[PDB]
Amino acid sequence: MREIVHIQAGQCGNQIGAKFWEVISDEHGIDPTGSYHGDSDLQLERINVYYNEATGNKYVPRAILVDLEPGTMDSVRSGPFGQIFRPDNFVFGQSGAGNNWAKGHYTEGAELVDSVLDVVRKESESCDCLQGFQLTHSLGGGTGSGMGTLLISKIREEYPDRIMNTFSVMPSPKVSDTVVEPYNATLSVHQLVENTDETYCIDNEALYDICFRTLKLTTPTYGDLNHLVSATMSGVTTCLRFPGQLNADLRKLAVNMVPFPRLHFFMPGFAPLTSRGSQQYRALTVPELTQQMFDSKNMMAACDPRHGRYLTVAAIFRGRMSMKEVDEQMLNVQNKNSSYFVEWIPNNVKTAVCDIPPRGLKMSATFIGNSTAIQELFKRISEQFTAMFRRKAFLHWYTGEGMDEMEFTEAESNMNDLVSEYQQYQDATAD
Amino acid sequence: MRECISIHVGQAGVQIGNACWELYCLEHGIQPDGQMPSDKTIGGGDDSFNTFFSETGAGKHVPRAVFVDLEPTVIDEVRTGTYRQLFHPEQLITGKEDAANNYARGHYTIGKEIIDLVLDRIRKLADQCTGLQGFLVFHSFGGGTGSGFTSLLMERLSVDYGKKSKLEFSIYPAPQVSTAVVEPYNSILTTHTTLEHSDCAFMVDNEAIYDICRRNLDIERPTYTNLNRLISQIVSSITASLRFDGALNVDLTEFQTNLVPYPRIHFPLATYAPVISAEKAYHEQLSVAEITNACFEPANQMVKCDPRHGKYMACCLLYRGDVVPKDVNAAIATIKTKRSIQFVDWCPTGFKVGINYQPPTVVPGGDLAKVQRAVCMLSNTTAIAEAWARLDHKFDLMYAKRAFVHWYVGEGMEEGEFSEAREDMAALEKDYEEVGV
Amino acid sequence: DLGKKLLEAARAGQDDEVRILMANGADVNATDASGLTPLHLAATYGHLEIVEVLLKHGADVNAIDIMGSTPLHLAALIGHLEIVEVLLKHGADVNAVDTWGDTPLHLAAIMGHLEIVEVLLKHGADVNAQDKFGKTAFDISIDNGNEDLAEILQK
Ligand SMILES: Nc1nc2c(ncn2[C@@H]2O[C@H](COP(=O)(O)OP(=O)(O)OP(=O)(O)O)[C@@H](O)[C@H]2O)c(=O)[nH]1
Ligand SMILES: Nc1nc2c(ncn2[C@@H]2O[C@H](COP(=O)(O)OP(=O)(O)O)[C@@H](O)[C@H]2O)c(=O)[nH]1
Ligand SMILES: [Ca+2]
Ligand SMILES: [Mg+2]
After folding, report:
1. Which EC numbers does the record give (chain B)?
2. CATH number for A110
């Protein structure tokens, strides 16, 4: 299990995708031209997971960039690492999908998807031992959501034995008050329960709330939101990018985290929270990192974990710190909060320590929770979907691209069944 | 002289095997390139150490060992380490993609792509033996390769080598160093499918070893390196009788005769003493009486359980070092009277004793002090059923909700196999109950 | 029949076509198959000028479709703040209830249109109004953990 193929689709997908590559390239000592400038052997031990080795000792991200809108292609190139991506790996259409899931999934997006598969194949056959795929996208738009889920299904049938992983950002009226986004997100969640192995739920509602109430940013920008996202994506991929034995590849992470096939939507969390101008943040202690990490205010999904139960949890501590101390604090938080873990999955919290911390920090902690409280996120979207759908508002935009109306009812039905399944295991006991 | 072939499966089996063969070489005087100056017969011989080492025409002494893993990372360290020249390079076998902590991948899907290569490489070692007696198989319970590939291998070895003995060293999982939530599943599944194919199995409880390193060796946070050095010291004490002259447990058959009264209850408990920190190089030397008493303290056992709660069916004491037989006899007599040691009614209430008069070897870099005398007690006691009960309970908690079961059925396993494996374990728990009343 | 053409012109935002059709006898209060009037459709699709035009030519500001939706329901749901204020200024019932028990306040709260929530509250929206499942707008804010909306509802 080595190579991961990374795909970013749509505006949000390419925006957070580019930020991902900027952040981890820096962690691995790689400059915008692709040259290793680092001073640690740990930075290269697993470089092959995300980068190809090119001609003159140069490293190229194993990345594929997709959008129906040409303009984002140029915005990517304009970026700090914009010249490190392979020119062959830009697949861009003529006109955007206009926030229409049906255009992304059925018409415009379907025309362009074969062009993307060819690039995927060329990168895949170039791998010695491919792990699987990661995709960054939003659920609220039309390209990332509609074309993204179509691309997932196509990849899944060509590579059925590989792991499919997504970083999927949930819509919020606080960031984009565009009323068809619950349609697009619900239609996409229906695809994601059937076609991905692991999904990180990155919730724009939570990102806004953190910036506004905790970081005290009166008017948060996408750059402010995406700062939290890049820190999170670096944290949750730490175990894949540096030597280690726990959750060290995408499949071993999956069998540790997913006890039931449909319940594969993760709540990520991060400590400490910083604001792009974090001044001289003093190092937190291990007990502080541990408490903050299980704190509702540090979750990237707008759910209260104290309203549900943890099925499984993976924690990653980064930096130089006492392994014995981490063992003690993790044991302690499981004793204090014993009623927030299911008792019928013994030893369901796994802890990794990584020596290299992220930029500008001496200590950091990353949280990956499979919690029944995530139903609060799906219930929020479901309520907005139902308010729009009962008045049949703007339905013709979708059926006009060939969608059947019964696709809306089946998607709504699936999300409500998903909510019921979380509630079922939240109420189960060991007896 | 009858040969024994060692097989090391998956990360735990490979890393413990590396530690064991290092210690073997030090005990026998074999250098890392295979040369053994004290061996006069060059190119062959019939000495006791030849049960574990073959000889080439150029005086090289080569372990009778195979290392197998489904990914290359761990075995690659053997191929580039201090003992890189010692092993047959064709007896280091690696795939590309591991079993993902999934018994079903080790046994059914990924494991089947390499099983025939492994058996052909084993046949090559077997063909060099004049009188192969059987196999020692090292593996974890918890990993996908250690659990799933091992049971596939044991199944095939029973077909290809029906009359040969098979002994296991099995790593029993502990949450302190566990890598996967499904380890109780893999443990039950491999136990059920291996039970009829294994003649004797020594379980190593990672939690017991962990606690001994903490308590006796003053290691604050033990790693695999600390655990494996202590485990290899104990494994060496158990196999010493096969590699040296002696009168107790001198071939694999005798292990079963002495330790296994009925085929299904074939899990002896090992206890070892003394374990002393290398920081105490001037410790007072403990007497034969003191180390023999320590064998009946639960804190020195390789598996966490209470033998005061059980009944003994067999008990062997293997001494190493400066040990006068009369002192063993007096120490046994005091223990046979003072302590509360109950045998079953149908067994002779005696202790078998073997003495090797060379003291244990310590590995440079290890955590152990040199000692003048040491003892390893091997006993079959019903109290080890407690270890199965703890595993079976964790199994039951998850299986009742069918948690994680989809991972196994997705890799070519039928869900009925979970129930068959669990019922076999219930029957095993009753087997111990019916003996110990 | 100019009524079906007026419905289409109101939905599509064709201001000039709306004026011509009205001058030729078109039924300003015509309905489609589900009871939607030109004012419903103009309020849904955000055509403020057509809303004002229809209201000066006999549009019933409180017409209900088959599901009990008024134009204010749909303007509050979709989030057209300017249209909400025009409808209220022309006598829209701020507390009209549809067949799901929802008021315009319910729908503005659910969709996160906080500025519209404030306007409705200033115009006498009933915070004690329960939908078919017993929920008031305040209940919706608590059950969703929308603290910004909850603060507004206790101003
Ligand atoms: N004592 C000891 N235990 C180990 C060692 N390595 C792994 N383990 C234990 O073995 C179990 C995991 O099994 P592994 O051997 O790592 O897995 P594997 O056999 O390589 O199988 P897969 O990786 O899943 O294909 C856990 O309970 C670990 O605590 C080791 O070197 N020493
Ligand atoms: N957090 C975050 N969200 C974004 C970003 N760009 C767009 N979005 C969200 O994505 C949704 C719109 O999807 P978008 O990617 O722009 O449409 P697409 O190009 O068709 O995939 C809305 O909910 C936006 O708030 C971004 O850079 N960061
Ligand atoms: Ca010889
Ligand atoms: Mg392994």
Report:
1. 3.6.5.-
2. 3.40.50.1440
